Amino acid sequence: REIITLQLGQCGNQIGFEFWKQLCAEHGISPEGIVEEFATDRKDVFFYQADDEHYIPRAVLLDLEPRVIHSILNSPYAKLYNPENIYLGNNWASGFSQGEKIHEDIFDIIDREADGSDSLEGFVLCHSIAGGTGSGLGSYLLERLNDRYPKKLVQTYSVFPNQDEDVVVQPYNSLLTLKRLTQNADCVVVLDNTALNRIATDRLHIQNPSFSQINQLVSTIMSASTTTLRYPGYMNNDLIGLIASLIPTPRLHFLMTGYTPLTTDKTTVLDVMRRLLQPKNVMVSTNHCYIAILNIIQGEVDPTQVHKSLQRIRERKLANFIPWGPASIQVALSRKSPYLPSAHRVSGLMMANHTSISSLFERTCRQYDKLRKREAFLEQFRKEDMFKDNFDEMDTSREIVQQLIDEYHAATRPDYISWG
Amino acid sequence: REIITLQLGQCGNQIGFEFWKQLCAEHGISPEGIVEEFATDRKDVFFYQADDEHYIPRAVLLDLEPRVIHSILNSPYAKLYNPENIYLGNNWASGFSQGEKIHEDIFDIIDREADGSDSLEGFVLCHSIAGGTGSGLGSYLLERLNDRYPKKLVQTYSVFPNQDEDVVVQPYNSLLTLKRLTQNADCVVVLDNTALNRIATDRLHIQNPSFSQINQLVSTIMSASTTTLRYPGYMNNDLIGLIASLIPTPRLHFLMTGYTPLTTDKTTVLDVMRRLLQPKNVMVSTNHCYIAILNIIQGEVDPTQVHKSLQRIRERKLANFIPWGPASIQVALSRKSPYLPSAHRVSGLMMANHTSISSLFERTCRQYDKLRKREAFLEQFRKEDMFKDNFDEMDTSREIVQQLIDEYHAATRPDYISWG
Amino acid sequence: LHGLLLDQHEEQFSLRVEILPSYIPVRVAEKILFVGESVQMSILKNQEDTFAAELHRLKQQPLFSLVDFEQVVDRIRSTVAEHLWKLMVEESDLLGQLKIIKDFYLLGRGELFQAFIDTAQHMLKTPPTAVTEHDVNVAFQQSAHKVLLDDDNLLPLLHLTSGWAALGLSYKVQWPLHILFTPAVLEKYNVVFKYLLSVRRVQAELQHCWALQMQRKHLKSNQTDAIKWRLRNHMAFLVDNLQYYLQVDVLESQFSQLLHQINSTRDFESIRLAHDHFLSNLLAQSFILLKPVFHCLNEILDLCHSFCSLVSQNLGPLDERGAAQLSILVKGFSRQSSLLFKILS
Amino acid sequence: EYLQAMRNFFLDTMYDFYTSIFDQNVSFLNVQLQELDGLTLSYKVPWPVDIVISLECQKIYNQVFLLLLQIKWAKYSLDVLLQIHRMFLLRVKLMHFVNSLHNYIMTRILHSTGLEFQHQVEEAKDLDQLIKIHYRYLSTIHDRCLLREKVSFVKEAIMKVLNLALMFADGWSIEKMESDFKNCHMFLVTILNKAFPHLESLALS
């Protein structure tokens, strides 16, 4: 039914602003919400059917120390949506304590759109991991969000914060955010700033406006993830229907992203399926092997050859996916979305459960381990001491991330009929 | 099926670079791997069907003290192939000891392409004999290569290193390389730097850029050796099918090269067959007589006259080939290769087993004998002493090369029904 | 003119021999049926009234003259035979289809049918002809999928009639656009196909077994007069490798003369005779034609097939009990080499 | 425009409608529609289209609708459900199966032949041949979704695994369910492995 989206932090507000602009550009609408004359499709998934034939997006804005919010304010995309949801540190503990005192008023902002909506389906979170203002605040609000409504779903769009060296408190912040990301979130789509920066320096020669182009990438991914919902499809026209197949085990919910063209500034089915399969078109970067893959295709595609394509990708036999119980790489096929001009027609997006993210988790765990052992980089503040005097929240997150690495590695084993 | 190629040493990297460039020039491709619009043929013999419709060559790069590798790096033929296989003395003992310690990581480089390939057919070695960096390292890696995989074939492209006087340790290096070349290699195509230098000073007036033009010669030979495989032929479309007919005795595997035009900067069949038969078009320089000859022709050829050509070359009766059991000079006919401009159309290449290379072996054996008897030119290093304290590897190579000269000379006899 | 049947109620279908003329010469009486036949399957319509005018002039004449009558028959034969030639060579693309026929029946492509033997070496049993038949088509297409014809060509199908004694290959051709291609013609192509696979199979075996170097002499010094089989591998290989090369000349000469004759002539009736010389030449000249020579060569093939098994199962140096069979084999090679000098004289 | 919508009654909008029913009465359905097996639908056809669209066509639509509703039921039942992990092994072991059947029937059959059918009917310029092309749609889709034959040789296992979709919802025993499923699933595969011709597109797992 109806999904309410959330954005917090300056990076999260940037990606949400770009997402709403990019769906305004996709749909046959004006930047005021007025429908165009050439419209149809389903436009109730994130757009409130507002009072002047406006499709107002339902977006929760959360900001602290507003810098980008003024730039969002003086724009012709503030006439598209304005639900009056604006409500005013760089540490996780500081953001946690600042979210502590004002939770009731932003919760009134939540309940306003909750009662304004007739139905509710899920909550999408635009949150920047170790983002300074976003960190701590987003973790606290995530905790209150899943506490209040256990009848809904949570997706969180996350980045892996490390530019490979800078800030020494960031592994603590991302670790505490990762603890809540495990136990208070039901689906996590993780992105790599390193992998996106490498692909941006690959296809182009830009490395300085990286945020602006990464906005374009994430908005395309988020729109392609929702095209079967926003346009009349048949399967996973709800969020939960999409989330259900991918997760065999309720803590194995980390979702890998790839995309079949790399440069965006006739081919057949099994071709782009095979290219989406490769890790060098995967834009997020002992054995590591996939649990289950789901893929969506959108473009000009001849539909009758897909079964022979399915056979050819089968006998090509590219991944030795899993031992114990049988998953698959699973296809979904969609139409290329109308109501806008379309270049680079054949475009695919893949959602996969892969244990290879345990390597990145062990990377930031090793960074935390060396910074904890050196003990000159915790940056002891009264915020962190008053939040936790013995700093055993780090210990709880540490044993939980150990359990998750154990879960990954024992799932990679042929025996996960015993738990571990 | 699929053949993996190897190149080591600066000379081997030069000839492999020229070979890959020359096959890029032959095939309808870009220097990025992109197919051209006028393409067909078989392009899986050395080219990985890569991920962007790239035909990436499957080449193992091995280098020590990189000089030419930087020049290979800053080139538009590093966009053709880049499998990230680059991994960093002038003695055989020094190269042997340097290959000793790092064998596992370069073996991981081997196994990477081995698992990357679905099938495996053979290993081609680009190795420079007594090349300084190449010597010792190539012998060690040859030993490990045939040790690991006895189910494949080994070809080694070899030069005869002597510019007829210089370096006094070179007969020891080439002798130890020749020991491994005998007992750890299954097919050897031997070339003469003297004969190629003489032909280069013959057809032209160049003697200073000899390496650059010799690159052109060897790349043409290597492409003409593989034209029946790379283009749709009928016989010896695998390496082993070619190697099988030429070898009657498993240590008689040394292959002689000639080529029917000498200068490259209408004739009939038996003409160019006869000219390919002569030793002065053979570009590698008691009785000496051929065991068996195989020849390939590529050009504009009227196909119906070849049997009368066969009769005429028979009754011309140019070589009294062998006593005991019946070999032949054996013809193969191919089409001239399309997808590139073709000057000097009628071109033939011959592969022959001839005992005349025993003369060159006795030449370098006599050089080793006088340098060993004089005993001021061994150039005693701790590398050679620690590798072999008594230097009996030279004795083992000496009795083996004696056995091989005996094998040559008794094969020249009418009796080789008794062994010797 | 109209190509209309029901012209004789009482005293495809043709004309009966009882009512066939002998006062008109018989070849002229053969051409009349062909001209009537081609209509049933341009400018034929444009000159119809002129043909009716000539035939009407024949109706006018009191007298009968074959010398006159034949010119009418020949003049119409030129155009009607030209029309089919004008269509099929270019618009049904006869020549490329002939190349495809050579690729798959005469093994103008042999890349597929070698790797096919590599992935289907599990047929030595008597087939039940209900399980192996499915498996051979599965293996065929799956072998094709690895490389080379990964876009279409599901047109040929394998099916069985050891597992290689039962074999059959089909190819549906466009039947209205190919009346030159008939099921009988494909039957002869099938016979040549089966022989050409037999020769490749036994030779692939024998060339594979020579790895005496590669695994059986490496780091060993082997025992002479125990590790030797008279080295008859090298003798048996020659008579197959030279024959292998002989087929190349035999093939390419006949392919070239057929593609010369078809270019020269501009009537389909000629193309019939050209094709009908071509296939018989393949049969007689590759000595697949039923001869005593064919028997002697089949004996050679059987001996090679048995010899490969013995050299296969031995592996690492061993000489016990293999010599007893090997003696029978070397005696048989002497016996059959004497026949090979009977084909020579 | 009527004709595409009619067979678009199945194949969202009806999604919310079917999901409310999952958690009886014929007016209780009706108000929900206006906003294990069952679901009678009734709709009027205008008479100039009634003489072209047969009465039996509605019945065939109802048959395939009836079979698919059970797959939607099973799909949604394992959707809302989100020694201890053994339930998760039992989750994947059936979730894979129901996803394959779902994908098969509705994309591979009910979307392939329909996209063909739309291209077919625009070449119909005659009243009578329109009826023959729509019957040639029905009689082939009634073969791909096989109900004319083997309703007790193949269909029984499809029936009996749907009761597992009933059992797994109640148990929100366990060893005795996989003991059944690994048996009947392998029996289904080893019978359908050689089978009318289009059913080999399911013989892959």
Write out chain A in H/E/C secondary structure: CCEEEEEECHHHHHHHHHHHHHHHHHCCECCCCCECCCCCCCCCCCEEECCCCCEEECEEEECCCCCHHHHHHCCCCCCCCCCCCCCCCCCHHHHHHHHHHCHHHHHHHHHHHHHHCCCCCEEEEECCCCCCCCCCHHHHHHHHHHHHCCCCEEEEEEEECCCCCCCCCHHHHHHHHHHHHHHCCCEEEEEEHHHHHHHHHHHCCCCCCHHHHHHHHHHHHHHHHHHHHHCCCCCCCCHHHHHHHHCCCCCCCEEEEEECCCCCCCCCHHHHHHHHHCCCCECCCCCCCEEEEEEEEEECCCHHHHHHHHHHHHHHCCCCCCCCCCCCEEEEEEECCCCCCCCCCCEEEEEEEECCHHHHHHHHHHHHHHHHHHCCCCCCCHHHHHHCCCCCHHHHHHHHHHHHHHHHHHHHCCCCCCCC
**C323 backbone dihedrals φ, ψ, rounded to 5°:** -70, -30
Q: Are C213 and C308 in contact (CB under 8 A)?
A: no
**Segment holding B351, helix H or strand E:** strand B347-354
Smallest CA–CA distance from C142 into chain A, residue:
A315
For residue C148, give the nearest of B42, B244, B250 by CB distance.
Answer: B42
Asked whether the beta carbons of residue C142 and residue A315 sit closer than 8 angstroms, the reply is: yes
> Does C238 contact B326 at a Cβ distance shorter than 8 Å?
yes
Q: Is B402 helix (H, G, I), strand (E, B) or coil?
A: helix
For an interface test with D, give the residue of A153, A245, A290, A291 to mutate (most D CBs within 10 A).
Answer: A245
Nearest to C256 among B146, B186, B303 (CB): B303
| Rounded to 5°, angle at Cα B36 from B33 and B38 | 155
Backbone angles phi and psi of A35, in degrees to 5: -70, 150
**Which of A117, A151, A229, A235 to mutate: most D Cβ within 10 Å?**
A235
β-sheet bridge partners, residue B350: B258, B295
User: C253 to chain B: which residues are within 8 Å by CB?
Assistant: 303-304
Q: Which site among A266, A273, A313, A315 would you substitute to test the C interface, given the most C Cβ atoms closer than 10 Å to its Cβ?
A: A315
Separation of first and last alpha carbons in chain B: 37
User: What is the distance between the alpha carbons of residues D205 and D189, in angstroms, rounded to a whole number?
Assistant: 7
Which long-range contacts does D46-51 make (Cβ < 8 Å, 24+ apart)? D46/D2, D49/D2, D49/D3
Residue A152, token pair as written in the block: 């809904």
β-strand pairing of A3-8 with B329-335: unpaired
Residue type, A203: R
Interface residue D88 vs chain A (CB under 8 A): yes
Residue D181: what are its φ and ψ, rounded to 5°? -70, -45
Residue numbers in A near B52 (CB within 8 A):
275
**Tokens coding D93:** 């072991």
Find where tokens 């016989």 sit.
Answer: B235
**Which of B37, B51, B115 is best to mutate for the A interface (most A CBs within 10 A)?**
B51
Among B352, B351, B349, B348, smallest CA distance to B269 is for B348
Distance CA D203, CA D188 (A): 9
Beta bridge partners of D20: none
Q: Which chains touch D (3 or more CB pairs under 8 A)?
A: A
Long-range interactions of A199-205: CB distance < 8 A, separation 24+:
A199/A262, A199/A283, A202/A262, A203/A262, A203/A263, A203/A264, A203/A265, A204/A263, A204/A265
CA angle (B135, B137, B141) in 5-degree steps = 125
DSSP string, B17-59: HHHHHHHHHHTTB-TTSPBPTT------SSEEE-TTS-EEE-E
How many CA atoms lie within 13 Å of A237's alpha carbon, on the beta-carbon side?
A: 19
- Which residues of B make up each annotated binding site for GTP? 130-136
Chains within contact range of chain B (3+ C-beta pairs < 8 Å): A, C
- C336: nearest Cα among C307, C297, C309: C297
Helix or strand (DSSP H, E) at C70: helix C66-91
Q: Would you call A166 an interface residue with chain C, using a CB distance cutoff of 8 Å?
A: no
Contact at CB, A312 and C142, closer than 8 angstroms: no
How far is CA A411 from each of CA A152, A252, A355, C301, D141, rounded to the nearest angstrom? 27, 9, 8, 56, 42
DSSP-based three-state secondary structure for B378: coil
CB neighbour class for C206 (10 Å; exposed up to 12, middle 13-18, buried from 19) = buried
How many residues are recorded in chain A?
Answer: 420
Closest CA to A397 of A124, A139, A97, A89: A139
Gap positions in chain D, given as the residue before each gap (C–N > 2.5 A)? 11, 23, 35, 82, 172, 195
Confirm if B221 and B289 have CB atoms less than 8 A apart.
no
Instruction: Find the closest chain B residue to C209 by CA distance.
Output: B244
- CA-wise closest residue to A297 among A349, A232, A237: A349
* Rounded CA separation B327/D74 (Å): 73
Contacts of C148 in chain B (CB under 8 A): 42
Question: If 0-12 CB within 10 Å is exposed, 13-18 middle and 19+ buried, where does residue A30 land?
Answer: middle
Place of tokens 């399980």: C131
* Preferred mutation among B34, B49, B52 to probe A, highest tally of A CBs within 10 A: B52
Cα gap C291→B193, rounded to integer Å:
55
Q: Kindly determine whether residue A416 and residue D103, on different chains, have CB atoms separated by under 8 Å.
A: no
CB C312 within 8 A of CB C211: no
Q: Which residues of D touch A150 (CB under 8 A)?
A: none
Structure-token pair, residue A27? 């749909």
Calpha distance C106→C193 (Å, rounded): 6
Contact residues for D19 (Cβ-Cβ < 8 A; gap 6+)? D76
Please, which residues bridge with residue B329 across strands?
B293
Structure tokens at C342: 């009977």
CB of B227 within 8 A of CB of B334? yes
Helices (H) and strands (E) in chain B, counts: 14, 11
Chain C interface, Cβ < 8 Å to A: 142, 145, 150
Helix (H) / strand (E) element for B199: namely helix B193-203
Name the residue with tokens 């919010």.
Answer: A69
Q: What phi and psi, each to the nearest 5 degrees, are found at residue B158? A: -125, 150
**For residues A54 and A81, what is the distance between their CA atoms, to the nearest angstrom?**
9
User: For residues A293 and A351, what is the distance between their CA atoms, to the nearest angstrom?
Assistant: 6
* Chain B residues with CB-CB distance to A281 below 8 A: 51
- Shortest CA distance from B115: residue in chain A: A318
Closest among A83, A68, A52 to A18, alpha carbons compared: A68
> Which of B259, B304, B253, B294 has the alpha carbon at shortest distance from B278?
B259
Residues forming a β-bridge with A48: A56
In chain B, the largest separation of any two C-alpha atoms, in whole Å, equals 65
Residue D86: which residues within 8 A CB-CB, separation 6 or more?
A: A417, D174, D175
The Cα–Cα gap between C41 and B337 comes to: 42
Q: At what angle do helices B137-148 and B103-116 cross, to 10 degrees?
A: 50
Q: Are strands B347-354 and B254-259 parallel, antiparallel or unpaired?
A: antiparallel
Residues from chain C contacting residue A312 (CB–CB below 8 Å): 145, 150
- Taking CA–CA distances from C144, the nearest residue in chain A reads A312
CA distance B139 to B97: 11
Instruction: Give the A window 298-357 contacts with C, CB below 8 Å.
Output: 312, 315
B191 touches B12 (CB < 8 A): no
In sequence order, the 6+-apart residues with CB closer than 8 A to the CB of C332 are C303
CB contact under 8 A, B146 and C115: no
> What does the alpha-carbon distance between residue D154 and residue A112 come to, in Å, rounded to a whole number?
53
CA dihedral B53, B59, B60, B63 (to 10 degrees): -110
Question: Per this entry, what is the length of chain B?
Answer: 420
- Shortest distance, CA A117 to any CA of chain D (angstroms): 15
Phi, psi of D187 (to 5 degrees): -65, -45
SS3 label, residue B8: strand
Which of A409, A394, A326, A414 is closest to A179 using CA atoms?
A394
How far apart, in whole angstroms, are the C-alpha atoms of residue A171 and residue A180?
14
Contact B274, B318 (CB under 8 A): yes
Q: Which chains touch A (3 or more CB pairs under 8 A)?
A: B, C, D
CB C158 within 8 A of CB C137: yes
Structure token digits, residue C156: 């040929």
Chain centroid to CA A225: how far? 10
b (16+ CB within 10 A) / e for A116-153: eeeebbbbbbbbbbbbbbbbbbbbbbbbbbbeeeeebb
What are the C-alpha distances in Å from A191 to residues A153, A198, A246, A318, A352? 20, 13, 17, 24, 13
Contacts B51 to A, Cβ<8 Å: 275, 278, 280-281
Question: How many angstroms separate the CA of residue B181 from the nearest CA in chain C?
Answer: 13
Distance (Å, rounded) from C-alpha A231 to C-alpha D28? Answer: 29
- The answer to whether residues C291 and C188 touch, using CB atoms and an 8 Å cutoff, is no
Sequence-distant (≥ 6) Cβ neighbours of residue A175 within 8 angstroms: A364, A368, A394, A397, A398, A401
Per the CB < 8 A criterion, the answer to whether B256 and B282 are in contact is yes
- What are A's interface residues with D at a Cβ cutoff of 8 A? 1, 119, 186, 232-235, 237-238, 240-241, 244-245, 247-250, 303-304, 307, 314, 324-328, 330-331, 333, 416-417, 419
Specify the amino acid at residue A114: A
Q: Is B4 helix (H, G, I), strand (E, B) or coil?
A: strand
Nearest-by-CA chain B residue for A316: B118
Query: CB–CB of B304 and C253 under 8 A?
Result: yes
d(CA A226, CA A209): 27
Cα A70 to Cα D88: distance, rounded to the nearest angstrom: 48
Angle in degrees, CA B182, B183, B185, rounded to 5? 70
E strand or H helix that includes residue C202: helix C183-209
Calpha distance C80→D202 (Å, rounded): 53
Tell me the chain A residues in contact with residue D111 when contact means C-beta distances shorter than 8 Å: 234, 303
Tokens of A117: 């909506």
Distance from CA of A320 to the nearest CA of C (A): 19
- Answer positive or negative: Cα dihedral of A367, A369, A375, A381: positive
* Tokens coding B68: 């030419």
CA–CA separation, B402 and B396 (whole Å): 10
Which residues of chain A lie closer than 8 angstroms to D96, CB-CB?
Answer: 325-328
At least 3 CB pairs under 8 A between chains B and D? no
Evaluate whether A300 touches A348 at the Cβ level (below 8 Å): no
Cα D162 to Cα B107, B184, D12, D95, D155, distances in angstroms = 53, 64, 24, 12, 11
Q: Which two tokens stand for residue B331?
A: 């013809």
Q: CB–CB of B271/B312 below 8 Å?
A: no
DSSP conformation letters of D116-147: HHHHHHTT--SHHHHHHHHHHHHHHHHHHTT-
The number of CA neighbours under 13 Å toward the Cβ of D145 is 28
Give whole-number Cα distances, A264 to A212, C236, D61, in Å.
15, 61, 44
Residue A67 phi, psi (nearest 5) = -120, -55
Burial of residue C229 (number of CB atoms within 10 Å: 0-12, 13-18, 19+): middle
Structure determination technique employed: cryo-EM
Query: Which residues from C are below 8 Å from B when comparing CB atoms?
Result: 107-111, 114-115, 146-148, 207-208, 210, 212-215, 217-219, 224, 231, 234-235, 237-238, 241-242, 244-245, 248-249, 252-253, 256
In this structure, are strands A329-335 and A290-299 parallel, antiparallel, or unpaired? parallel
